[PDB]
């Protein structure tokens, strides 16, 4: 009954040309629950035979911000192998990040005001967004810094634009969604002497038996020919449109199923990717009370951003290594529980791991912009329907 009505919903969301397609996956520890449903086409662009290729479980998707879980997993594997201490200064491996000044602001003459950072950066600061780094667009000062063209000097030191911006605050001063994970990816490459693509294969893909996961998609024509195209929703008519647009924070292309294999491993506590104890640490609310409050105050005040997605707009959350932790049950028993870690991806990608309930789910969409009402409501419905079936069943 709940699941059927939930599938009824998707079938009619694709029928109505509201969503290009969606991949719904749900797995539990025990093996009882293995839900996998494939709706619609992968692209809104009609093919050469005037058909619409379906969105299948084997379909390579642009993960975007969903890649940060995979990088976190890589960074923790290095830590697990004694290549890094979680609360050790990045100084040795990331001397570049450690050289970085902090943007105070600008003077009357428009010139930037910089300062030496106070306090050290650890992989934890990085993994928990407390590093002091932002994303250029997310920060007012950084946005101002970028338009007045201050990253013009980068060229002469070979500094990569991605890692060229300064710090906005001191480490552990506040929760800022930033380039912390892309920098952690750098550390992994620098600790192992392996590029993220090679490392991801060896350490993430190979142990779970994964093919449909890569950073360098172009080098896999096998996977390229089978990939989903990005769909955008007209801010104007709400119609769908075709859109043709080695960093740890975003670069990954993965099929829905291949991503699930990762999560399932994490849920099961199989020890395949990370030591179960190391996984338990990921789900720990990493934030200091001051920062736990600051984060929620900002998140409640930022519905335009909405880091939660399907999640209630106003709620008690903290952050751990790899995602946002529910510090309260979302709808008591009926849905997601306390200690549920989750994160998203730009094209309406949303994953979660509910250890308390013993469930993990993913909704794969290849549809921009983020937090799309249709997608959000559909996701809310899928999880809720699943939790309903699992509980009575």
UniProtKB/Swiss-Prot annotation:
Alphabetically ordered keywords of this record: Acyltransferase, Hydrolase, Transferase
Null allele phenotype: Loss of lovastatin biosynthesis.
Biotechnology: Lovastatin acts as a hypolipidemic agent that works as inhibitor of (3S)-hydroxymethylglutaryl-coenzyme A (HMG-CoA) reductase (HMGR) which reduces HMG-CoA to mevalonate and is the key step in cholesterol biosynthesis. Lovastatin, simvastatin and related compounds are widely used to treat hypercholesteremia and reduce the risk of cardiovascular disease. Furthermore, statins such as lovastatin were found to be anticancer agents.
Effect of residue 179 to T: Strongly increases simvastatin synthase activity upon overexpression in E.coli
Known EC number: 2.3.1.238
Claim: Hydrolase is one of the keywords in the record: yes
Keyword Acyltransferase applies: yes
GO biological process: antibiotic biosynthetic process; defense response to fungus; lovastatin biosynthetic process; polyketide biosynthetic process
GO MF terms held by the record: acyltransferase activity; hydrolase activity; polyketide synthase activity
Reported effect, residue 75 to V: Strongly increases simvastatin synthase activity upon overexpression in E.coli
Residues annotated as catalytic: 65 (acyl-ester intermediate)
Binding-site residues for 2-methylbutanoate, renumbered to this chain: 346
Gene3D superfamilies the UniProt entry points to: DD-peptidase/beta-lactamase superfamily
Residues annotated for monacolin J binding in this entry: 62, 162, 177, 368, 370
Superkingdom of the organism of origin: Eukaryota
Pfam family, one: Beta-lactamase
Oligomeric form and interacting partners: Interacts with LovF.
Note: Directed evolution toward higher catalytic activity with free diketides led to an enzyme with 1000-fold higher activity in simvastatin synthesis, due to numerous mutations that affect protein folding and promote optimal alignment of the residues that are important for substrate binding and catalysis.
Family from the record: Belongs to the class-A beta-lactamase family.
Physiological role: Monacolin J acid methylbutanoyltransferase; part of the gene cluster that mediates the biosynthesis of lovastatin (also known as mevinolin, mevacor or monacolin K), a hypolipidemic inhibitor of (3S)-hydroxymethylglutaryl-coenzyme A (HMG-CoA) reductase (HMGR). The first step in the biosynthesis of lovastatin is the production of dihydromonacolin L acid by the lovastatin nonaketide synthase lovB and the trans-acting enoyl reductase lovC via condensation of one acetyl-CoA unit and 8 malonyl-CoA units. Dihydromonacolin L acid is released from lovB by the thioesterase lovG.
Name of the protein in question: Monacolin J acid methylbutanoyltransferase
Species this chain originates from: Aspergillus terreus
